[PDB]
Amino acid sequence: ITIFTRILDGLLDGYDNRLRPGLGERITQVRTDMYVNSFGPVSDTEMEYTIDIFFAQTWKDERLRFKGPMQRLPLDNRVADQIWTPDTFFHNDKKSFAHGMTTPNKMLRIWNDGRVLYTMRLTISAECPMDLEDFPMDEQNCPLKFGSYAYPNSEVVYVWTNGSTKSVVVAEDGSRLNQYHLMGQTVGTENISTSTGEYTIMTAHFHLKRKIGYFVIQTYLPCIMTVILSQVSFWLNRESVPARTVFGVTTVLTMTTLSISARNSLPKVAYATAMDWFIAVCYAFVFSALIEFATVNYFTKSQPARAAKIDKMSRIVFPILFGTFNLVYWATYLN
Amino acid sequence: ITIFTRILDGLLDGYDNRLRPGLGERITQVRTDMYVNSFGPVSDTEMEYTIDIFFAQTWKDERLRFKGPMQRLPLDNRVADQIWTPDTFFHNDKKSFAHGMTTPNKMLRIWNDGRVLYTMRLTISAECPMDLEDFPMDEQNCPLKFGSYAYPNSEVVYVWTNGSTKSVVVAEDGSRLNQYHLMGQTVGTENISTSTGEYTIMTAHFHLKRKIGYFVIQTYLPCIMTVILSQVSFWLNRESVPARTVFGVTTVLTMTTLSISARNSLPKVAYATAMDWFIAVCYAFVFSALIEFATVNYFTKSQPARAAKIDKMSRIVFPILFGTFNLVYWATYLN
Amino acid sequence: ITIFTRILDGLLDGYDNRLRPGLGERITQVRTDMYVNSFGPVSDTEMEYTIDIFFAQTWKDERLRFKGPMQRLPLDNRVADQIWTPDTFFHNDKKSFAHGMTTPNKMLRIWNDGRVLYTMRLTISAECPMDLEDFPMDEQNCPLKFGSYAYPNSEVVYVWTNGSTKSVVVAEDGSRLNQYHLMGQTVGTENISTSTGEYTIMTAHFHLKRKIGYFVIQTYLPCIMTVILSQVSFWLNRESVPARTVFGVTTVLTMTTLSISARNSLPKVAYATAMDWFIAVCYAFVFSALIEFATVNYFTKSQPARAAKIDKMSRIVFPILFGTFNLVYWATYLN
Amino acid sequence: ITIFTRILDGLLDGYDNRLRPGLGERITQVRTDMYVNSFGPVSDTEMEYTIDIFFAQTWKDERLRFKGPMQRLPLDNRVADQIWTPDTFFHNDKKSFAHGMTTPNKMLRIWNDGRVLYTMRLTISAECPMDLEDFPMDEQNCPLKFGSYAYPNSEVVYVWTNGSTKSVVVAEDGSRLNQYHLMGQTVGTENISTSTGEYTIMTAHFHLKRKIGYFVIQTYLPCIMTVILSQVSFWLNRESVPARTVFGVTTVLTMTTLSISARNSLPKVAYATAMDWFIAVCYAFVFSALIEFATVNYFTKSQPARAAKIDKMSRIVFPILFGTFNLVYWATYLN
Amino acid sequence: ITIFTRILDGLLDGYDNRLRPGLGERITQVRTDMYVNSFGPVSDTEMEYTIDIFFAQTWKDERLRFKGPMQRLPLDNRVADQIWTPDTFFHNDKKSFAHGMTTPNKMLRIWNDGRVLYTMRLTISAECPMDLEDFPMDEQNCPLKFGSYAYPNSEVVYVWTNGSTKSVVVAEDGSRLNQYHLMGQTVGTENISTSTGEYTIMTAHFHLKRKIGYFVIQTYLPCIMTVILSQVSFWLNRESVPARTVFGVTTVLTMTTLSISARNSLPKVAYATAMDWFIAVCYAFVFSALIEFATVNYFTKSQPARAAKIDKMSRIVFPILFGTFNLVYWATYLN
Ligand SMILES: CC(=O)[C@H]1CC[C@H]2[C@@H]3CC[C@@H]4C[C@H](O)CC[C@]4(C)[C@H]3CC[C@]12C
Ligand SMILES: CC(=O)[C@H]1CC[C@H]2[C@@H]3CC[C@@H]4C[C@H](O)CC[C@]4(C)[C@H]3CC[C@]12C
Ligand SMILES: CC(=O)[C@H]1CC[C@H]2[C@@H]3CC[C@@H]4C[C@H](O)CC[C@]4(C)[C@H]3CC[C@]12C
Ligand SMILES: CC(=O)[C@H]1CC[C@H]2[C@@H]3CC[C@@H]4C[C@H](O)CC[C@]4(C)[C@H]3CC[C@]12C
Ligand SMILES: CC(=O)[C@H]1CC[C@H]2[C@@H]3CC[C@@H]4C[C@H](O)CC[C@]4(C)[C@H]3CC[C@]12C
Ligand SMILES: CCOC(=O)c1ncn2c1CN(C)C(=O)c1cc(F)ccc1-2
Ligand SMILES: CCOC(=O)c1ncn2c1CN(C)C(=O)c1cc(F)ccc1-2
Ligand SMILES: CCOC(=O)c1ncn2c1CN(C)C(=O)c1cc(F)ccc1-2
Ligand SMILES: CCOC(=O)c1ncn2c1CN(C)C(=O)c1cc(F)ccc1-2
Ligand SMILES: CCOC(=O)c1ncn2c1CN(C)C(=O)c1cc(F)ccc1-2
Ligand SMILES: *[C@@H]1O[C@H](CO)[C@@H](O)[C@H](O)[C@H]1NC(C)=O
Ligand SMILES: *[C@@H]1O[C@H](CO)[C@@H](O)[C@H](O)[C@H]1NC(C)=O
Ligand SMILES: *[C@@H]1O[C@H](CO)[C@@H](O)[C@H](O)[C@H]1NC(C)=O
Ligand SMILES: *[C@@H]1O[C@H](CO)[C@@H](O)[C@H](O)[C@H]1NC(C)=O
Ligand SMILES: *[C@@H]1O[C@H](CO)[C@@H](O)[C@H](O)[C@H]1NC(C)=O
Ligand SMILES: *[C@@H]1O[C@H](CO)[C@@H](O)[C@H](O)[C@H]1NC(C)=O
């Protein structure tokens, strides 16, 4: 153990962590790996998502080159703080933190040739814009961008691990989401020209397809039952004005109540959503069934034969219409 | 007191906490104990649970081997920071923190032979997936996985305490939960092969049985009374179209109102829940009682004798049906 | 000022804060005082309560014994870190923090004989289980336990201040609670045998009696008015089937609406609450008034005289029953 | 610049920040100034308020007395930490924090004679009990108490700035509140005898007048319309039992619905609020209009002429009563 | 690399970060740049907005002027802490924090001539008062003011960038908001006289125009449908007192239900909002249609010809009126 105490002391004696490795000589290339331990909750209201990853980075540093019996130096964060590390930051991040129990989860390993490995565990809430036009039969793509904050392209460059280690890995246990399904992952690299030089930023996209199960139970199913409720009126006595009247208005109150409740749980966007149309049409089918009787009753005095054909015809026309509406609605958005 | 100041200074003189004990010589074996002071709130929506534990770890470090009058060295965190400790982290953790008042709750004890005792207090929110198909007659198993972050199996190994201290202990005060019951605990050890070596991870499962009391009061009971409400209609005058009509529709509005409220308090999962079916069937029993009258009124003019048997039988079939339905529902899920 | 700088420097010169005072000689006895500046919000849902206290502790450290003109040394937190202090932790704590503005509120005072006074201000959210069977005519007792984390009975012992300084003091300004009333305070001491030795834990119980004012306004009163609403039906025309029918069902919808709203605000426990019964009985009084008419209507054809006695007697039986129900309900739980 | 480096080094050379200025000689007098940058949200439910202030303190420290070309030493927080400062804490505080971006906002300035200026920016959530008996025609007064935590009157004394600089200043931008109006400010000084000596505490009261606008829109106005709704019944056909019956019960359901929602937004106190009475009376005016008809219908069979005067009289008596009630209600509380 | 280690050591050798550059000779001028990476959520209730910016500042410090092969010194935060920096704080800030993952996002660059570049990433929640009289056809302007906390105009001055870097830049991805649209940005400088000298404060205004889409879907449309619902009553049988009565009251109950939910999502201000009027008028149109029938029914017995003209005229007057109402409402506020 005393052998390694002098090796560490020798490497760090006179080591200037303020300067990057290969300053004025080479561009420090960093091979970045990643393992998604858990895909945190996604929010279609706040347009963000949380993710728990093991973010690994390896680069070249000649100052740490040593020769000894061991081929690797297993070390903790106590050394990761004393040496230089890339100040990798996440561009689209909202807030982030590195897990600290028991000690700040930072693993450092130094090989003879100077190869460094500096990985940590991060829970980060990043941005994810969404176009909820097809919501809840929706598909969104949440990116994760990260690069160096202080080092332009001339000073530092990032690249993904190619071949040995998979670029992005995701655990099946953590990927489980109540309302989304993780389709896959995509990685890429790009250069960006900013007012403080051109930086290389590394993107990692997580494709998501929304699960409609919760919404069939909450909104679609009760709406369907409430338009069928309105269409019961056609089979009741046409001459019983109070019965047909109170039935038509109470069902509108029912649909009006149902649309009020469904509104609270839906994203607060400023455009029409695929569900917003389903609720709209259903309200029209409930409102229409009421107007249907208002016409039936208006003609009862002088044109009762006409008011009878309207009601009897409405018994088949209404369900056939709402039936075909669903045939088109689901056939359109489920594609 | 002056004796112990030189012993501590002597041990820490030249002590390199950056290196694990026995590097290149022995494997640091850590005996892990745990005491659940409180089982924090469990969340079936966020699929997580909070837990408050005293997490103890003991290993052997020859560098701390000393000779003196005392057999043990009672010390605080002021020494725990100066020595080496295993960087044990919890794999399924979402967020964790160690209690700090008055001082960081870390207890250190060093015996003559060099065995160390390093325990701390942790409140941690860990992951716990759930299959809420039988909710609220549910059973879940929440795990707690923890291992070393930087040291694979070759460098460090974990084992549960055998004999003196029980692996996992639970306090009678804290395990109390409003909606859950802690059945028991299970401990285990397993090896995992990762891209940074093979680590030993220690699992601790907490079995949970849900308490249906809250849900019988909130949803089951009012639904049952509201279908019984619908079945009152069969005993009223069939020829009074407004009475039977307004009664049939108002109860649907009532059942529709009841189902809207129950939906908010239930988990926002995307599959059918055991309660979701009970609400569904009840809505069907209310909707049927209405359709039952719609037929009675439809046949009342030309087929009054036929419409009479429908109403009278509905007086017994409906309650007998809903009665037998409950017999099957509860008998099925309570098993 | 130059006199005290050498006294302080002399005391701290060679002072080892890692070791407790009187190690291997005497047991460090700590007299703990407490002043509740404010009793934070109590939660009957999360089973928790917040409290803001000035937590004072005094012991004797021979190393700090000095001789000088001043009898005591007024000092800030800048010295509290340099000396030894008991690592007092709160056993039932959930989350705690020490006020830091302007500077960390820690007061240190050192007397000639070496007796120390070390107090701080703490806001702590501690556990408080509740048996809400009589809720909201309830009484709860919230404890506050604190002891040493690293020093067993043999090494450190706690005792309450008796006589000179009051053990626990509470300001009437902070004791104000919207839904609770602070009856009093009780203090005690006990020994607990743990796997790391036997420790002494100090308990402080705060007795609470719940205030029913908010609930009479929110729930009891509207329920009473809504069952009296149901009993208006007996005075209406028996031959008007729609009038009596819509009145009976709409009031059930009203009571069903009223009970749904009261449900969200009430604690989410899994057992029957004293109020849950009051809402239950009231719903029964509204549901019965409806069933009462269904029977009246069922007998109207062949037994109208019997259907008349039912309605007319119900005008007095119902209010006398609900009247006497309140007489019994309130008389039982208010005791 | 090298001149000031030697002056600062000279002043801080041998400076003991653990000791207060004038220890064992004089009482350190601190003139405290304050500037309310913003008056954070006020909460009548949690009985607290947030406030953002620039908290200034000035005293004399003879050790910092220097002679040089400059008359004052403009310094940042880097020096404020190195010297002694009063450990001023806010007694009624619940949680506070000092702004840190870019650097901890602490301004230090040292004059020749040794007078120091040490100001900081603080956002603090302080306590503010309220007597909401006249709510929402309300007026509250929130205090702000602060003194030294470790230094009694004998060692430190606080006094407000007088003359040139005003004790408390408030910006018109921050004083804007959605539901409150800031009447003015009051400052005062007092001594308090505590178990750790007698301290001097400085109070700053902020007088508040509540804005009734939000509640007229939410609660008062719809209630007024809903009692006028109930009084429509008197003008409808008295012999139409279903019409008058369904109208009477639906308005009660409407008023019962309205009172449930207004309740959620109101403070959860345990006494009657000025609004609680307005809602109560309105419910009584809706409930009475229903009983009015129940009487009309009860007398219609045998005493129809009397049932006519009741209905016709109620057309004038009811609105005149609700009219005079409002005349008295507003005249009482708005005074 | 060893060349730069002596240069840095040479520059920092004897460097006093407590003193500003050019003290007692020149005014430290700081050119401030800004890049809005994301425009965080805006709150019309809390009157605040969150923003994520790259806040850059550049000044000249002669002490850091060096001669070497490189023209600039790429450095991290490890040096930014060791040198002097302007203590720039944001005046209207409520809560701010600088991103810390991986390392504190502070970029430092030192040119030969002594020019420094000190930029950081900040997420800050600043104040933004609003006049929501025209809400939701609204326009608001949220400012962002920042200056030096300890250095008045005489010692430090702030200025906007000269043309190299644009003063305020906004990212195309992050500026997207659900309910607002970012029109543009305006920058300015002003002097303010405070009790601690006169400071220069830098303003940055972000103009916002509200999106009416969400409110058309949530409130306007259902209100439109519910007043049209009320106007159906004129076409139904005038002599059917129950039919017209239950329809009139239920639509009021429906509109009354609609107004409470609309109130929940709207800002809790104490003045009348453009929507508050639209909801009010719609309630008047539903209530009026009810009073319309009460008049028709009151005249039905003795003045049926008058009760016929009233009802028939109402079929056109009501929709024509509500039609023109929208024409004026939308035409006025949409301008
Ligand atoms: C002529 C007739 O059979 C009546 C019965 C119900 C009436 C409708 C009710 C809803 C609308 C009310 C509005 O005031 C005028 C247009 C609308 C659409 C009315 C047009 C005329 C209708 C259809
Ligand atoms: C002929 C008859 O007794 C009528 C009375 C109520 C009617 C039902 C009401 C609900 C549905 C409405 C839909 O438009 C057609 C199918 C459904 C299921 C109707 C079929 C015909 C029924 C059963
Ligand atoms: C025969 C008679 O006076 C009728 C009127 C209302 C009816 C009750 C309505 C509620 C229940 C409905 C259920 O379907 C059968 C039992 C229950 C309890 C009925 C039994 C028979 C009653 C009491
Ligand atoms: C005789 C008469 O005009 C009836 C019509 C409505 C009835 C009241 C309804 C509400 C109450 C119901 C209770 O069961 C008895 C007392 C109460 C207050 C009744 C007393 C008698 C009244 C006033
Ligand atoms: C005579 C007549 O056509 C009646 C029918 C509905 C009545 C109105 C109902 C609402 C109000 C009730 C109040 O008690 C008196 C004024 C108000 C405004 C009444 C005035 C008289 C009206 C308009
Ligand atoms: C794919 C790159 O992987 C990392 O960067 C990494 N960094 C730390 N660890 C890993 C591997 N990994 C996915 C773990 O879960 C894990 C499990 C352990 F028991 C100990 C360490 C790690
Ligand atoms: C316009 C003012 O900009 C800055 O002062 C600034 N400060 C840091 N950075 C920038 C440039 N900028 C707009 C970035 O996005 C960026 C991107 C990177 F990958 C690394 C650093 C920065
Ligand atoms: C069984 C696991 O034991 C620990 O890991 C442990 N660590 C600290 N403590 C314990 C023992 N234990 C269960 C306590 O509750 C306790 C009680 C005290 F008053 C002081 C210290 C502890
Ligand atoms: C019960 C032990 O109390 C303390 O140890 C204590 N610590 C701080 N303070 C006290 C006394 N006390 C009850 C106060 O309220 C108070 C009032 C002040 F103005 C200044 C300091 C304190
Ligand atoms: C009245 C008490 O005032 C202070 O003690 C104070 N402390 C800090 N500052 C002030 C003056 N003041 C009212 C400011 O707004 C201000 C404005 C600045 F740009 C920089 C510093 C300050
Ligand atoms: C992008 O950046 C990388 C950084 O190494 C560089 O090699 C490549 O030539 C650049 N290409 C473009 C188009 O910017
Ligand atoms: C797992 O690892 C431990 C390391 O101590 C070893 O003793 C055990 O045999 C291993 N078991 C398996 C199944 O790999
Ligand atoms: C606690 O145990 C100690 C011995 O360690 C004993 O002296 C003391 O009296 C005990 N206290 C109580 C309350 O039993
Ligand atoms: C409070 O105490 C101070 C001494 O520190 C004294 O000067 C002052 O007069 C006292 N106030 C009152 C009201 O007695
Ligand atoms: C313009 O501003 C930049 C800020 O970095 C500065 O370096 C440069 O010297 C300035 N030049 C002029 C002409 O203002
Ligand atoms: C701001 O103050 C400085 C102080 O010298 C002055 O030169 C400048 O003209 C002032 N600018 C404004 C807009 O007041």
Residue numbers in the entry:
A (entry chain C), B (entry chain D), C (entry chain E), D (entry chain A), E (entry chain B): 15 to 322, 393 to 419
Task: Quote the study that presented this structure, word for word.
α5 subunit-containing γ-aminobutyric acid type A (GABAA) receptors represent a promising drug target for neurological and neuropsychiatric disorders. γ-Aminobutyric acid type A (GABAA) receptors belong to the pentameric ligand-gated ion channel superfamily (pLGIC), and in response to the neurotransmitter GABA open an intrinsic ion channel that permits the passage of chloride ions and drives inhibitory neurotransmission in the mammalian central nervous system. In contrast, clinical modulators such as benzodiazepines that treat anxiety, muscle spasm, epilepsy and insomnia bind at the extracellular interface between the α-subunit principal face and the γ-subunit complementary face (between α1/2/3/5 and γ2) and do not induce obvious conformational changes to the pocket in structures solved so far. Instead, here we performed rational engineering to generate high-yielding, high-stability, simplified homomeric and heteromeric constructs based around the α5 subunit that could be structurally resolved by X-ray crystallography or cryo-EM.
